[PDB]
């Protein structure tokens, strides 16, 4: 049976090729986690298709009806095999779904237009003049609604209650809202998308202080998946032959326009 | 019952309370993972007992013999039922023991005397006036006999056939042939105890270059364990809750001598 991947359009792990109108099935796309795809259905042996989520979110499970949506949904009510995404491994999920050792290690941080007066997120905490938020439905938002520590909960108490809403539906909703507001709107997202985005034009936007956390993204499967152990000493022998490292080279610096 | 917990002395992760022939049980050591296992022990609500692994050993498997020593091997035997220290996460060990997701996220690095003029592992594998090697019987040395790329299998090339011996038994040998060799040895370590080190009296070496890989440790327990699950699921709570990073910055930083 081929296996049904679910993965998420979020640059640069999953986009569209140039040219993807006159190409059918995998081939339309390209990116870190489609050449991560690929060698891990290599290792293990098996067929493929990538699908988009489509609802175009991570994972969160709704407090009313506590139903799970996004990537994990597809996951934990069979709709998809397995998830290949910057997929953030959390407590909360790693109860209904299982997750590889991590493929990539990161963590939250701060993103400034630039020439913006902010270094660390207490800068942010101090001030009102310039507004930040974070994605929506993500690890990143629910990192802030959750921590006890007195700068994260100041700035948390802040973004929940702002008018307008600082939260955004995509990461490229955030960054085009930090490049738009002259300096007044700061992002919190992963690192490795600061990275990222700092290295593409109009290199307008710079990431800035420490990360606030640590955490890692993993492969997930559902739990009593035939594929998850084995899709676990995948993720392990490709970082140990230097595959993973390899590949953020070539997505996120070897592409650089800075 | 009690849960045998095996661990090794390497500061500063567990080491002997300065009097502990005063003290009994748990109570003679202290260290990051000393603290580590009281919560996770409080998390998953178990009594335990802390346990020196005998031969002073991380866990390697002996080709021809087949026997696994170190921790993991007294994991893989039944001496233990649970293994809490700086034990990294690999496919080999993966593929006999289980291992949480990982409580530090970490890479090999290059310690060197201060005034070494080196500052990449380019420049080792491109002189031979400054001697270096590696923890020997460790994950470290693997990555070295195992890589395929260019310069580490350069690096790996020298080290195995360097006479004396440039591998050391114990990270306080490595470090005691980097302070004494006048800038003649670079040590290979990883990350976390190097930048350990480094805030150590007399404060003579140094951290250079960036990290070789990426890898974790993980709290490791035998295959098939009943603790394997809540164990886990304990890292990831206490790392969303921040006791990770609390616990580094006690025994990294907070008590720096430089
Ligand atoms: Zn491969
Ligand atoms: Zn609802
Ligand atoms: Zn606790």
Redesign the interface.
Known sequence: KTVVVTTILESPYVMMKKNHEMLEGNERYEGYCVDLAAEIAKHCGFKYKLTIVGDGKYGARDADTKIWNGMVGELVYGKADIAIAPLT???VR??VID?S??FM?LGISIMIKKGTPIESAEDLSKQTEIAYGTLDSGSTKE?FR????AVFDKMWTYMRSAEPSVFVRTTAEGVARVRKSKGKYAYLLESTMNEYIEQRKPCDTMKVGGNL????Y?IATPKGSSLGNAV??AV??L????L??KLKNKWWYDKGEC
């Open positions: 491994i959390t407590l790693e109860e997750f050792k991590p290690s990192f959750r921590s006890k520590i956390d640590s955490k890692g993993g676990n000493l392990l022998k970082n140990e032959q230097g993973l490292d």
